[PDB]
Amino acid sequence: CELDRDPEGKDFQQPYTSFVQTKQNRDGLYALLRNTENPRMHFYQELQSDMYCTTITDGNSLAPFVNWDLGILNDHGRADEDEVSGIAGYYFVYNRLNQQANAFVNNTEAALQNQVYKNSTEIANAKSFLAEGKVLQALAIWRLMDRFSFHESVTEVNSGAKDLGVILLKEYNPGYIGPRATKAQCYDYILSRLSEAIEVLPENRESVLYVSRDYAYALRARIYLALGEYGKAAADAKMVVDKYPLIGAADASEFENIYRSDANNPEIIFRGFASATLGSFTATTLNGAAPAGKDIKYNPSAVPFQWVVDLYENEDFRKSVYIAKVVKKDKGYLVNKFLEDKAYRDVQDKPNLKVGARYFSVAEVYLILVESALQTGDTPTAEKYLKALSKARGAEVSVVNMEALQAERTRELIGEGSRLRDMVRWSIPNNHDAFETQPGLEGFANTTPLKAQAPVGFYAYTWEFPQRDRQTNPQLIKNWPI
């Protein structure tokens, strides 16, 4: 009686014997990344910024983030075989990305040292798959650092944590239960992973669906910027900023058709693969969309304060695409950046509001070069690239002077999880209790006070660690006092 049973649709873990086994595992890494560096995952930190008020429709999904309900944000999220959502989710997806990028990076390095490949053409490509795995680790550890390590500006913290990064693990080890690495460890792992990869990746990008040198340049520049290293961010900026041109639109409809097309947006540096049948997801949290026949109706759960609407000139193509006056049919604006890519519609005629995961677009690089150039005294190229970005958007900017940077960035990066970080570094308090709500939306978008204030350096600009990781690892030091 042989009573081994082995599960169908599963294979045993083994080391990489062939090049075809390696390539297949690199895809699973990129699949993983697609539900991780995913716009759904960055909405939580998008909604926690100073830009949104909750509507009467919300069912306490976005309220903990908009109104700073610290009693809910503490344990926020889930991460089981039913739902991966919230803070706990953001945490869990980036760790799996890192762990699984661990076993890929380490198993390619093993195969190379065991000379298993059949010629130098495989060897050369697998040494290049190796650099990609490295960038994914740096992204995974950086995204974990963006949200669970403190800025230098924070005041009160649990004792010990102001200098801690996240738990750094450079090995594929599921049983690992260690302590938090230091800040300079985590950032030196991120930057050196990226440096070791920028050496190997070829000057010209081979696929917009995979890691390239152009991407790692940009992701690195994003990271330097949030590190205050203004001069160093501007150098990675300049290496890619000129290879991706801005959307050529005459009105806002030519703009929306191009921007919303994953396939035809010349600004997309690195995106996740999407079809209607694989890799497309709905991201209808910000916009509240639902199909109605051939149409789209909206019931949002949160909407911008008036000052966000008033950021956009009326001739700004983003003012009908990034935000859209389609709340209460035509009375107020919502954030509509992630509305749909029509290419993912099951039937041309009918919307299903599916989009793909974008990972870096040259618009962000324009804004990183512009901000950094202002700080390092380079006005000529600080104003060149900001006027360039706003004129392409139909509302070229009056004066270029950092005050101007903050608006244009806020406009362009809206919806992308970027504003909350910008206010920490720009030393802006929340000031949500005093913003005017959109008047056209009276009775649907009302003011709701903060359940807890968030002044400069408030500890809750940084998320606490998930209570799973705290309860199973007494050697984990918490972020929040007491």
Binding site: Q21, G59, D69, N95, Q100, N473
Partner: protein
């Protein structure tokens, strides 16, 4: 069947027959001492949670092994059988008594014996039929929810509808919004204001009636029993249909047949079969236990009463309105017509046996059977309905297959070496196999009711991957069992066995288990006769047992496909792994005593027990840095100490007047002893419970203190400080609370009086020490969030400067999950009341066709004494959400005998 020394409770025909629910374990709540059954959903299709002598484990199931006539079958397959075909249930609750079962006999075993034909001369046919209705059993939850304009008022004054708005300004807006929404659908545009008032501030919509109904239960049954010689037959056909009282559709109907047969062929051989099958249709309310706006008991409490799901004739509309909605919202019946669902199960249960007797004393018994389930399920999303996102329809067909075979053959030698030494030897073999399989395909894009074949869907971006899942397991085991009996007063039982499970790797799938036991007949040896003591026996047992109820594939370290594009395959790591995962090794010391009083008209049986789970199968949670969720490991330990006693006796005054009572009790203290990763405690995140080494599975929250009369703020006690309060809640204010999650007291009682054909039976059940978090009240009682939903009438009283003398806080602050939600879910329940009348004997002589008839009136679940503020106190473990309460049943029934 079971040992002279094992703890054994046996339940009779009557506790099992004629029950308006297909979950027969509910019919045992409060009947077996130490057996704690609890059904947490009134959904017809739900199955109870039996646990003998505590929770056996923190990761493997603690459900008893179920056996019907020799073959392990799931509660699901037992549900498709006719329980009028059940002769008796025997509960085996110690290692001595459960020694010849495997898989998981560490949880006790429930053995169900179907009736065989009585070796009668005429042979009895017997006919049963009953009708009755289901209701909800508690209404008290909506006695104190705000009324319509009570809630309007609360909101307006709370600023939820904006600042400086009057009540009428607001109702002007809500009626405005229903008029323009309804005005866009041809099916509504000139019915709003004539026949539809979705918004109505002058009548409160009865949201209980919207989502719950009275529903029927119907069952009937004929059964021919008899046989005569060496052969016996028991055959029955039957019908059952229980419709679910939630208006969200749910039902369990079965069409049943069974034939039991035994025949002596000659002085050496006896063969026999029991054959059972059924066509069964089940459907379940799948939105319960989640928080969805207008459904379930959460719906019936939280829907603002100025929202009307009804029309103008009091009937339920197709669709209701909620402000902001972009679509009218389908009501529960109209959702059902638009989301149809059906499923047919063909259930087969074949079991034979052979009993060769070659020479005096030995009995070779070979037994085998299959347990095939082919289930076929259909689901649609009906096209052209204007309250959907698209006019295009979808259809999903699935097919399921479960085949589980098991052979289990024995050789048994009984002999005697004197007049005072009885010996019995028996050893046996058993192979258990299970092969399961699930296949499903679906299409979309349909544009016609009549053109909805799967093969007719759109093809392109509308195509899907099929659904496909397979699962198999297997068990190989060799067992032995001996019986020594000296002078018929001293009896010893010994057993050794080895079990091997497919669920563990090759190097760890075997395990050895043993048991010793002795029964000592104190009455018949040390006291030949007493004028009041009738029977006195002392039993005692020690033994070890296996527990294997976990996944089928939980040790391998595996890869699955995770494709990135469409032209190449992709591969990710799937499971963490435990090459050493193996059996959970449980241990039982049981000291029992049974006593018989007067003239065997008064019995007692007390048992003290010590249940130990070592090598415990924990599905250990893993830190998220690991990139996994779980991985089973043999990690940790646990203890279950307790007592269970049961006693019964008879009270005649007239002999032609029987009065008989019965009582049933267990207490059980639980102790986790060893955890994982050196941990002393592990709180289970966002569950409000905690595993801590010293104590049992307990709740873990902050002690809510009340409010600061000065500020209106909520206060919690700060643990350890002196008593110290705070307005600043933090997760580090939580502490272990001396309340257990598995309820420690299980019990029941049942009375009976019989006059002369007329008799009354009532069965009670209780579960004290139960505690539950009322997740529902997290919504109904707060004034800081979810301001759409109806609230409890206590928030009209909330602290403000001028109304500063309350214990309900100021509005604007959300509640934390603290003790204010820990409710005492203890309950006594009247499990069934039955008045029955068997027609007199002299009413039949003269008509030689009918021999008797019986009529009965009957109620299930009418009395529920409890302090719990949420419908059913049984409907939950640690939390109680949008519950489907257990039902209350009234049934009248008939029986015929020919």
């Amino acid at each position: 069947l079971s040992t002279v020394s094992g703890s054994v409770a046996k339940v009779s025909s009557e506790k099992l027959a004629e029950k308006p629910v297909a979950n027969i374990m509910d019919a045992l709540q409060g009947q077996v001492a130490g057996m704690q059954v609890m059904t947490t959903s009134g959904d017809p299709t739900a199955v109870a949670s039996v646990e003998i002598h505590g929770t056996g484990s923190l990761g493997a199931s603690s459900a008893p092994l179920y056996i019907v006539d020799g073959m392990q079958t799931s509660l699901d397959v037992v549900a498709t059988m006719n329980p009028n075909d059940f002769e008796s249930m025997s509960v085996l609750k110690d290692a001595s008594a459960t020694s010849i079962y495997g898989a998981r006999a560490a949880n006790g075993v429930v053995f169900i014996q179907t009736k065989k034909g009585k070796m009668s001369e005429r042979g009895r046919i017997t006919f049963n039929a009953s009708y009755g209705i289901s209701q909800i059993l508690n209404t008290k939850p909506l006695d104190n929810m705000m009324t319509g304009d009570e809630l309007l008022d609360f909101q307006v004054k709370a600023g939820f509808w904006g600042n400086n708005q009057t009540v009428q300004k607001v109702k002007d807006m809500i009626l405005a919004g229903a008029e323009d929404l309804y005005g866009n659908y041809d099916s509504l545009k000139d019915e709003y204001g004539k026949t539809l008032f979705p918004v109505d501030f002058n009548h409160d919509a009865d949201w209980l009636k919207a989502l719950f109904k009275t529903a029927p239960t119907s069952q009937g049954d004929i059964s021919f029993s008899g046989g005569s010689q060496g052969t016996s037959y028991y055959a029955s056909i039957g019908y059952f249909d229980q419709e679910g009282m939630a208006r969200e559709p749910a039902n369990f109907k079965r069409y049943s047949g069974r034939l039991n047969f035994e025949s002596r062929i000659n002085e050496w051989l006896k063969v026999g079969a029991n054959l059972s099958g059924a066509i069964a249709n089940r459907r379940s309310a799948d939105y319960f236990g989640k928080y969805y706006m207008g459904s379930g008991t959460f719906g019936v409490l939280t829907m603002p009463r100025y929202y009307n799901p009804f029309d103008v004739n009091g009937d339920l509309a197709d669709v209701y309105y909620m402000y902001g909605a972009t679509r009218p919202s389908m009501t529960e019946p109209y959702f059902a017509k638009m989301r149809p669902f059906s499923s047919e199960s063909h259930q087969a249960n074949v079991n034979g046996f052979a009993q060769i007797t070659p020479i005096k004393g030995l009995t070779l018994k070979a037994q085998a059977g299959v347990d095939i389930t082919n289930t076929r399920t259909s689901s649609k999303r009906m096209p052209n309905n204007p309250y959907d996102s698209t006019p295009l329809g979808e259809r999903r067909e699935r097919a399921y297959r479960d085949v589980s075979k098991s052979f289990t053959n024995t050789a048994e030698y009984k002999f005697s070496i004197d007049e005072k030494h009885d010996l019995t030897a028996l050893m046996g073999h058993e192979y258990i196999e299970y092969e399961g399989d699930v296949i499903g395909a679906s299409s979309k894009g349909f544009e016609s009711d009549k053109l909805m074949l799967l093969s007719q869907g759109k093809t392109g971006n509308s195509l899907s991957l099929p659904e496909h899942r397979v699962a198999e397991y297997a068990y190989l085991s060799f067992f032995s069992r001996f019986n020594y009996g000296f002078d018929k007063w001293m009896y010893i039982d010994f057993s050794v066995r080895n079990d091997q499970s497919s669920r563990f790797g090759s190097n760890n799938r075997s395990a050895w288990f043993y048991s010793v036991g002795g029964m000592f007949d104190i009455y018949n040896k040390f006291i030949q006769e007493s004028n009041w003591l009738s029977d006195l026996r002392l039993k005692m047992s020690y033994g070890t047992t296996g527990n294997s109820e976990i996944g089928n594939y939980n040790h391998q370290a595996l890869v699955t496909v995770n494709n990135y594009t469409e032209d190449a395959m992709g591969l990710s790591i799937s499971t963490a792994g435990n090459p050493d995962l193996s059996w959970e090794k449980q241990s039982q010391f049981n000291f029992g005593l049974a006593a018989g009083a007067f003239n065997n008209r008064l019995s007692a049986e007390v048992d003290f027990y010590v249940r130990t789970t070592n090598d415990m199968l924990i599905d250990v949670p893993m830190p998220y840095i690991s990139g996994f969720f779980s991985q089973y490991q043999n990690v940790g330990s646990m203890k279950n100490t307790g007592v269970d006693l049961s006693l019964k006796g008879t009270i005649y005054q007239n002999k032609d007047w029987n009065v008989y009572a019965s009582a049933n009790f267990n207490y059980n203290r639980q102790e986790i002893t060893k955890l994982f990763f050196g941990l002393n405690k592990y709180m289970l995140p966002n569950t409000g419970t905690i595993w801590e080494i010293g104590y049992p599975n307990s709740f873990y929250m902050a002690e809510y203190a009340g409010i600061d009369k000065k500020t209106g703020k909520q206060l919690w006690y700060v643990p350890g400080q002196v008593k110290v309060t705070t307005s600043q809640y933090s997760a580090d204010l939580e502490t272990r609370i001396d309340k257990s999650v598995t309820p420690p007291i299980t019990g029941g009682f049942s009375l009976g009086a019989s006059w002369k054909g007329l008799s009354l039976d009532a069965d009670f059940a209780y579960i004290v020490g139960k505690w539950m978090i009322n997740n529902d009240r997290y919504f109904t009682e707060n004034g800081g969030g979810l301001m759409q939903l109806n609230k409890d009438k206590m928030l009209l009283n909330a602290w403000t400067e001028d109304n500063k003398e309350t214990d309900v806080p100021k509005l604007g602050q959300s509640p934390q999950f603290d003790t204010h939600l820990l409710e005492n879910a203890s309950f006594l329940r009247l499990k069934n009341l039955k008045l029955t009348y068997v027609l007199p004997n002299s009413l039949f002589a003269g008509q030689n066709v009918i021999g008797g008839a019986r009529v009965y009136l009957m109620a299930r679940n009418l009395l529920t004494v409890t302090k719990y503020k949420g419908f059913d106190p049984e409907a939950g473990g640690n939390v109680g959400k949008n519950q489907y309460p257990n039902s209350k049943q009234y049934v009248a029934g008939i029986q015929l005998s020919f």
